[PDB]
């Protein structure tokens, strides 16, 4: 359990020094299972879009900006008011909104037997409350959420019953076709800025510094590297009678230079597009290291006074729209948008220390005198590798099992002449480098010299499993005996010739990181020889 | 300009207690147009649905969830696997994506014509551009953003003239309809969680918790104080072999806790609906204040091994999805969502603070000469204000413009005898309370005595705008002594004998703050004896 | 082992809704170990001060100003250049730093005496080692973290030794007293600022807006509700040709604003600090709710042209200092900064939902084939509760483990008349209300009607463990099989009469919830009649 604090002050106030040095045993290494690199730190991970929204609504809140919400639905005719006849061409690039319409269906008589093959006992009340549950879906006043639950409360049967009916009986519900309508999503927050401005302005003092960071739709030929059909603008708008295109230029170096930025660009928007003065309409860029090529964070410009005025406003109006993924791909260095927004239809590659925190040992003691036993026995095995032969280890331990006592004779052994008890590979440490795993000896003695270069940079780049041959050995031993005293078996002999195979030292490794080390077409080389013989009587 | 290191340095070790005392005219009081509370501070606002959000979001990153981004946009028949049959009913909630088509169209020969008469020259080689424009605009391959730019490049004319011939020669653009396709936008997260999850799970190690703050959308009856047609769901996953609806619970609770929430309740949701494994349907409901009632913050449930079959998922998978406008409500103390998301489509009341910053003196000296001389002037009256009459009392300055000197002689006055200099308001001091604005005498004395307990609540309660009658009055008799200078004027009379209007004392408030100081049908009640009588010569 | 896509989707394809219905089983209950509320959520907890503190960072950061670290050690001659004379009494608050001199000792032949009778072999060589060592540490260049490493080192022995060479040669190491110095550490943000604005400013365009939030120290009489040793400044400065209080104003209503407060006061500060341009010093209150009176805080004023002369600065400077653990007691309603920074050193109360997430069951069976027959047996007792006596129910089932097969005959009965088979408590539910254990049955028929309204409001208020008193009986029961299993026992009776304790059903409560149970002095209230007869054979 815990330890005694009366013997530890004591033994401390005899000799604080001595106590100080023994006292390291009353603190337990932790069980094998759960030792370092198996042992994995858990925190919460944020996502790169979602981090730089975040620091981009600070970005504008340092600026003084207030923090709004825009509508994200809009009809078709705010498009036209603000981009005016172009929209004619511009409004293929937004998403338009399309839905069901409510279908009238009746009940009766086929439908009646329908529903009664079913096994459904109707009465006349039942097929009423029914025919009243399709009126209320056809007349709107029931949602699809809860069609189910009504018709099954109608009929007086089980929930699935009631979608048993609403299927069956009525499958016309299947034909229904969206019907499309006026309004569609906004395909940038311009689209809401005017349509918040116009009712916000007359009420409140101006300047206004209003900003949003919010998702905007747009309709494209395909995605690209740098191109979604659903984005994210950090948007803003300054209101004043004094605004000029200046101002979306000192709202572009102060977003870009609280990121780190200090060299951005400006450059004419060709497009002219005509929710925007003459020649204000501006394109931002900021460079983008991995992909070489400078790119556009940001877009800005002054609002016509043709759509302000179709708005109400009297007064101008710049907007600055930035598309927070394509600064995002800036700060996280990647190169594809797609990659980095849904990065779970992509792969996710096992580093060296997560192949090397999914290696396992496979056999170890489950009662705690057993397993402490063969961290005993491993120790002895490390002190007496060197024996010289022929050899012999005994270590007798007697064990108590409620009333019974069992002694337990576990003898490792060397027969023949010229050997060592245990052999060059018994100390040999598991590591892993660039997707590979390698079973390496201390020291380089007799290996062949080719590999030892590989096999020093794995020692020294690589990451350890801190698990030796010896330690999976050991603990597969003193497992085998507890498998015996469950077993009723009193003897048994257990032998580790050369090892060849993760499975020989007791290890086994977690299905993922094998299929990427194939995948990968890498090696797991574990190999050596451990000449380990050993013999356990159970009296 | 700034004080004199070494002058002040001396004087303050001549003595440094006189020092310190007569060193605080060193420090210049701020032009009476920035003093408080005429001075506002700025900072930027965050909104309510926003903070929400990233608290939300470190609320789910601090309890070991990785953030995720799932797909917005989904196919029709993804909810047929979610939902079974039952999507026949559901996807009347969905809205579905609609889209114009490109059109086709040719140039030639009455369209040449309209362009011509456009005046527009073209060449049977600006035709053929333009034809392939149009080409090329059927086939997909030019945006509806590069239209008129290509149009206008193509003519070598103006963009405003390539909007010109689009609009007018092509005006079947306009007949363009929109056209249903099978995608629709998610109504939770879990139209996007199945597809992240079945793409995910074969790639990683279990178990697994994400979780997505994100906007999802309904098509609903009609917008409600809870209900909008665009929501934020702060939805999670969590996949693992051993998953219950217990980690639903907890969940929740863990979100909840972490927001102040010591109370909730837990209720079996009576939808059943299909994608959720039977009876694990939960919904979780937490206390509005200030509706008085119980209000649905969050949904959670196991997902049904049938949708998690058809999606190559074989383990158990609890979903919760927590509304952010919900939570937000409680937070925030909103009763109304639209009012609460969309507070700019509402109104913006002005504060006691608000009214009396917005209430400003009108004319003041430009001239540093003469604002100080205004000053002392000011302090020389409220010291002479109690002289017993006839008084009199000259102010004689000389002032140097350049080459000329001219010496100004302010004299203010009270012939009639039994009176005193100045009378008994003439320090009165603006303030504002419960919306109404009251000009107030610093003691009651020979106040009606109706008014004395209302007039006293807002000295005591009430915001003050720290300008008293012989303030505003001064400073515009001073103003008319540099009006004088600048008009070739040597002599004048300036007198105010009873105020009965801000203007009388030289303040004027903004319009906005009088629009609502009307509308809510409050009084502005200026009034008092202040009898002041000046003559000034300019020699 | 995970569930059969194959097997699912055919059942699902033959008929949806059974499918729908009976896939239920595929989702394994969680252990009744880990099943709500026993499952707690985790998550990372903020302490209140310091989140007060961050939240203030960013209301500085919002309203434009720049974070600054100041010095934290100042020496006493900066506080008289601040303070002036005032220095010889404001000093006293001052906390001075000091520090220990080094030793100077040397070797010499009774210390060589003791470091011989120690056990240590030292040659000449050795004994001039720490001849160095002992003279390196006099100089200065000695860390003391290092000094027994370095002990260690010379004389060629254990590190422990080295230290015990230090203690018991070198004791007059503790002889060593500290001595004073002339530095301070700073008591408020000021003694920083001038320090830093004296090197800044020269440096930096006009006007500046600085801040920092950092820990400054006062020694004070003893601490109070509202004052400790040592406190956080939430500090700034203004520094422009043009400042004056008002903008303190303006930083106190921006600060406080942010946070909430719609209402603070201002209010001459008696003191008259000298490092404040006379009448400047200014007090701001806000209202704490829960103490019911009006708080300090925040402090500002205008710094002296005399001390800002000192360091060389021309220009007036407003400097505010707000403290973070008043506001900090505002905003979370503590009404003792000791137990609001310092929580540990006080209590920690359990609420019901800790206390019910205590009660952990007893024995339950270790294998999962048990484990479910426990479930299954549980269910069982349920259906038959109300079988007229004599009763009996038999389960016969066989269990293989490996070769043998097992025949379990588990039979529940009542042999005596006019009863049922189980009895009237057999249904009694665990909850935990105001810091009571009540085990309440679903009905409240026989009970003494004292008692009915009190275990009907914990029934509806309180907290449940969701465990019924069968549950724990049964999982006694089948937990008893296993032993008899491997006790190899082939009968046996159980038996549960009159519930009387917790542990009569087979339930215990965690140590620290007892503690509280009782120290509260409250009820653990589990009793009733169960009358539950069984044997079991195994065969
Ligand atoms: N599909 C998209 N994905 C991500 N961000 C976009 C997308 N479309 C536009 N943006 C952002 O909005 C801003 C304005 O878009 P704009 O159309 O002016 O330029 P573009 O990159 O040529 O787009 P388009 O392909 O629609 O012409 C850009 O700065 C970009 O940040
Ligand atoms: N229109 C909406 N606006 C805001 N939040 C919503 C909206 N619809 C659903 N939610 C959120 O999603 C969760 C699940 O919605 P659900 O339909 O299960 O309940 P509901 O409130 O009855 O909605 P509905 O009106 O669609 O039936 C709710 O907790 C709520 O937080
Ligand atoms: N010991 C303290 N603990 C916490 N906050 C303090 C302490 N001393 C001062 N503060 C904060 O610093 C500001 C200035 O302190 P000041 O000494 O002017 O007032 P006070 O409360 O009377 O302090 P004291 O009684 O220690 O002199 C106060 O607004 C308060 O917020």
């Not at 060397?414 to 060592?420: I, S």
Request: charged share 30%.
């Amino acid at each position: 359990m815990r330890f005694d604090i009366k013997k530890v002050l004591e033994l401390a106030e005899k000799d604080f020094e001595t106590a100080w040095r023994e006292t390291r045993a009353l603190i337990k290494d932790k069980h094998i299972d759960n030792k370092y690199p198996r042992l994995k730190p858990v925190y919460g991970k944020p996502h790169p879009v979602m981090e730089t929204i975040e620091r981009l609504r600070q970005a504008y809140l340092r600026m003084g900006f207030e923090e709004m919400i825009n509508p994200v639905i809009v009809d078709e005719m705010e498009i036209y008011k603000q981009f005016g006849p172009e929209a004619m061409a511009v409004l293929d690039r937004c998403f338009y909104l399309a839905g069901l319409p409510r279908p009238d269906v009746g009940l009766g008589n086929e439908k009646v037997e329908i529903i009664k093959n079913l096994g459904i006992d109707i009465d006349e009340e039942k097929k009423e409350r029914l025919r009243e549950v399709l009126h209320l879906y056809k007349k709107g006043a029931i949602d699809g959420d809860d069609l189910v639950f009504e018709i099954a409360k109608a009929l007086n049967v089980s929930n699935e019953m009631g979608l048993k009916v609403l299927e069956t009986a009525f499958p016309e519900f299947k034909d229904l076709k969206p019907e499309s309508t006026t309004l569609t999503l906004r395909s940038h927050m311009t689209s809401g800025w005017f349509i918040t401005l116009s009712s916000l302005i007359k009420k409140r003092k101006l300047p206004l510094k209003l900003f949003s960071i919010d998702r905007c739709f747009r309709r494209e030929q395909r995605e690209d590297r740098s191109h979604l059909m659903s984005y994210h603008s950090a948007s803003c708008v300054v209101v004043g009678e004094d605004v000029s295109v200046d101002d979306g230029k000192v709202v572009a170096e102060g977003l870009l230079a609280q990121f780190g930025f200090t060299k951005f660009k400006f450059k004419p928007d060709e497009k002219k597009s005509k929710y925007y003065t003459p020649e204000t309409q501006t394109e931002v860029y900021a460079y983008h290291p991995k992909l070489g090529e400078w790119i556009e964070v940001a877009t800005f410009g002054v609002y016509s006074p043709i759509a302000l005025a179709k708005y109400n406003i009297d007064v101008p109006v710049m907007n600055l729209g930035l598309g927070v993924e394509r600064l995002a791909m800036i700060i996280y260095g990647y190169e594809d948008v797609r990659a980095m927004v849904y990065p779970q239809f992509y792969e996710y590659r096992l580093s060296d220390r997560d192949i090397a925190g999914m290696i396992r040992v496979d056999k170890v003691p489950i009662l705690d005198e057993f397993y402490n036993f063969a961290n005993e026995l491993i120790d002895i095995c490390i002190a007496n590798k060197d024996k010289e032969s022929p050899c012999s280890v005994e270590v007798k331990r007697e064990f108590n099992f409620n009333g019974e006592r069992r002694v337990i004779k576990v003898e490792i052994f060397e027969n023949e002449p010229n050997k060592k008890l245990l052999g060059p590979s018994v100390l040999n440490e598991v590591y892993v480098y660039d997707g590979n795993i390698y079973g390496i000896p201390p020291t380089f003695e007799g290996v062949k010299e080719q590999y030892i270069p590989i096999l020093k940079k794995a020692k020294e780049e690589g990451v350890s499993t801190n698990i030796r041959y010896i330690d999976g050995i050991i603990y597969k031993l003193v497992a085998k005996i507890e498998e015996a005293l469950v077993s009723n078996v009193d003897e048994f002999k257990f032998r580790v010739p050369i090892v060849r195979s993760l499975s020989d030292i007791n290890l086994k490794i977690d299905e993922l990181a094998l299929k990427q080390i194939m995948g990968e077409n890498k090696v797991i080389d574990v190999r050596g020889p451990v000449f380990l013989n050993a013999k356990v009587e159970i009296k």
